[PDB]
Symmetry: C2
Subunit: 443 residues, 2 copies
């Protein structure tokens, strides 16, 4: 099992703590293919996408899409944070990612994807207010949450509050401004409008670039989902849940570190407003499953019942920490989304799981199977998930965006560093929780 | 009030019976403005869009979109049928419209819009199987229903069954085939795929050209609506209702005229399947309004609650004859759609009514107001609607596609012959029902 990592000399960033963690997990695992896949995937972000300048900046590419997503970058380095106290260079690089993220938010808090400098690119032609520092300007609530999540974990783990600079203060004020704009209370249209001349229906917005109507009940409108597909009803439930938790983290930072209580209070009160509106509008009494969370709602009474593989998703709510895994409405939702009552759940000869309209019919995303494992309370279920992930990689040793339910050799995104990070993180979690016997029972 | 009709020498088709009807209504009406609008609108189709070859063919343009829609053409000559027994040339022309519609269906039963010959046009580059005889190929269930409706009413009025030729037999077989393909039972994708590179989200289809998934519960998928906007969930309820009725008319024709009892039974069997599925899936228990009809459903349990102005619409069900006007679920739906609980209902300084995502926020379609009048059981409501139509035409004396809720001078489609026909039809209906005194009470 020769590694599919790049040759040592070609790896973009090296962490001694990451290398020792990998050596350790390989030693513990008896399944040689699993160990090989772990080694391929866990460090892929560092091997292939990290540009650390040695000082205060880290730019992080997604993989086979050559720009930096706020979402991807916040996830791509997530499991490394727990190693930061053992590795000074790793710690500096992580602080650089967070500092870069806040600078990106400051450039445009509506934008999902950024260039390293001012290169422009193919989406300068989009019918929206573009700057050459942007790769793409799809408004996605979760773009602003992932950096807050990363920064909070980095701070709690390391005690290093120096990331909460004047650029952070500018950024978090932009986050509040943007979230409140997108409650669309005074104007159904507003400051964010997006169209693109494209054949892909979900890469442009309905109603002349304004999206489908919302009734302004307190939820935050998201123009696009974490899949980068346009929302159908703009009050995207998983992303609103993620906003609640992220604003509360922000409030704690603002009170404790910055002594900026007015901004903290604005975060707290907005979080409570969004949470109250989720309780009032995001629940659907399903005749089969009982009370479940809707995927998207419009505030008029429409509720879209589905899930999409991309995190934040319904199945992943407890992974991000937005609900407790025991939440009865979550457990009902979990049963619903992993069934043929979900329009984007697919089952065939090669496996089963959730995809979405991004790639279309019958294309299962490994992320959904990973999130089923992350949120499982049952060993047999976790084992089934891990074996499926091993048996649906087309022998590449990496995580893909999606694969066909009847043929894993038909797959999308060969080099998707967020997904590789998630797989490494999953295996590490399971080993650290004392479940190496379960993994070693895979023959 | 000088007429806005063309001068006599520029009128494309002249009917003696239509002129007699106009002169009769003008003499009965005492409101000069209303009489003027009637005269402008009722014959607009004949005046400006009809090309009858004197034999067996009539081509009918929409107005300011220079192609023939199966929907528009089937409605544009509808109110003239009742005059056909007294005007041989009008009769011949109507039979020519029908014959042309069956010819169109035989060219491509998935296509909405046709050229007179092989001119091609802007949409030849669409990502679908195009032919130069097509102006557009957006699959809309109602495209196949409007011709059957016209044909049945022409047959019942005139007794002329000569229109039900071998070309009809081919055509109705294609209708059955197409409807059944679009139940999507054995293949969730199927023979019809459509994308277009466009900034307009609803002018292309999701999921790589297949649209959003449907669970094959027996309903018929419509890729697009009568607005020409893509469906959100493909089992479009008003169109499925229209299909049931249209299939039963076709069964009657096939039994009585063509002596084809097996093909007739195939129509009836399908009608019964769609009807059963509408009962099981199309009803939503609205907490404010009671049981209502959903606008679109996917068969998985998703139901979209709204209405769009274009007929077939929810408000128009009794106009087309698909439900009785005192169906309790219909009456509940009627209250819901004409309310701010409908995302596409707008109220402003100029009036109120229903639009849709075709033209977008705040744009009300006169068709919705007309349909409210057509389906009204109250003289005062009827009078209010007629007054609103008169007060929202920007002084043009014609019916428009849409007008801004706060300013009727901001309007779309100055020359829209379907809409002009509907207005004439409405006024004629009210006079023929004995309600001229109501019309003459408008000051
Ligand atoms: Cl649009
Ligand atoms: Cl509060
Ligand atoms: Cl095993
Ligand atoms: Cl009056």
């Amino acid at each position: 099992y020769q590694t599919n990592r790049p040759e040592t000399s070609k790896r973009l960033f090296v962490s001694q703590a990451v290398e020792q963690q990998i050596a350790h997990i390989k030693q513990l695992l008896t399944n040689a293919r699993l160990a090989w896949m772990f080694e391929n995937c866990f460090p892929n972000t560092l091997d292939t996408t990290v540009h650390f300048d040695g000082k205060d900046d880290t730019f992080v590419y997604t993989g086979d899409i050559h720009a930096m997503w706020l979402r991807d970058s916040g996830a791509q380095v997530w499991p490394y944070v727990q190693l930061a106290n053992k590795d000074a260079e790793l710690k500096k690089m992580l602080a650089g990612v967070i500092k870069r993220q806040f600078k990106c938010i400051n450039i445009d808090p509506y934008a999902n994807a950024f260039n390293m400098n001012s290169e422009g690119g193919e989406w300068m032609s989009d019918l929206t207010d573009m700057k050459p520092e942007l790769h793409e300007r799809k408004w996605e609530i979760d773009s602003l949450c992932y950096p807050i999540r990363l920064a909070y974990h980095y701070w709690k783990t390391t005690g290093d509050a120096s990331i909460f600079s004047d650029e952070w203060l500018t950024a978090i004020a932009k986050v509040l401004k943007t979230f409140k704009e997108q409650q669309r209370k005074e104007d159904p249209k507003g400051p964010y409008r997006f169209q693109r001349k494209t054949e892909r229906a979900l890469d442009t917005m309905t109603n002349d670039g304004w999206g489908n109507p919302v009734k302004p009940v307190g939820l935050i409108a998201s123009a696009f989902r974490p899949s980068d597909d346009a929302t159908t009803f703009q009050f995207l439930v998983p992303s609103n849940f993620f906003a609640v938790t992220s604003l509360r983290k922000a409030a704690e930072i603002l009170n404790t570190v910055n002594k900026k209580p007015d901004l903290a209070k604005e975060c707290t009160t907005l979080s409570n407003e969004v949470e109250a509106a989720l309780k009032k509008y995001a629940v659907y009494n399903h005749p089969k499953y009982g009370k479940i969370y809707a995927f998207e709602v419009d505030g008029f009474g429409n509720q879209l019942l589905m899930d999409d593989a991309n995190v934040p998703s319904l199945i992943a709510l407890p992974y991000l920490g937005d609900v407790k895994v025991n939440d009865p409405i979550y457990q009902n939702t979990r049963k619903f989304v992993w069934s043929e009552d979900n329009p984007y759940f697919f089952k065939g000869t090669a496996g089963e799981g959730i995809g979405g309209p991004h790639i279309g019919y019958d294309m299962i995303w490994p992320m959904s199977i990973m999130m089923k494992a992350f949120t499982s309370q049952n060993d047999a279920e976790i084992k089934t998930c891990i074996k499926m992930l091993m048996d649906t990689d087309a022998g590449t040793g990496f995580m893909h965006e999606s694969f066909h339910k009847n043929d894993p050799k038909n797959f999308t995104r060969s080099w998707f560093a967020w997904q590789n990070t998630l797989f490494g993180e999953l295996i590490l979690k399971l080993v650290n929780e004392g479940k190496v016997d379960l993994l070693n029972s895979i023959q």
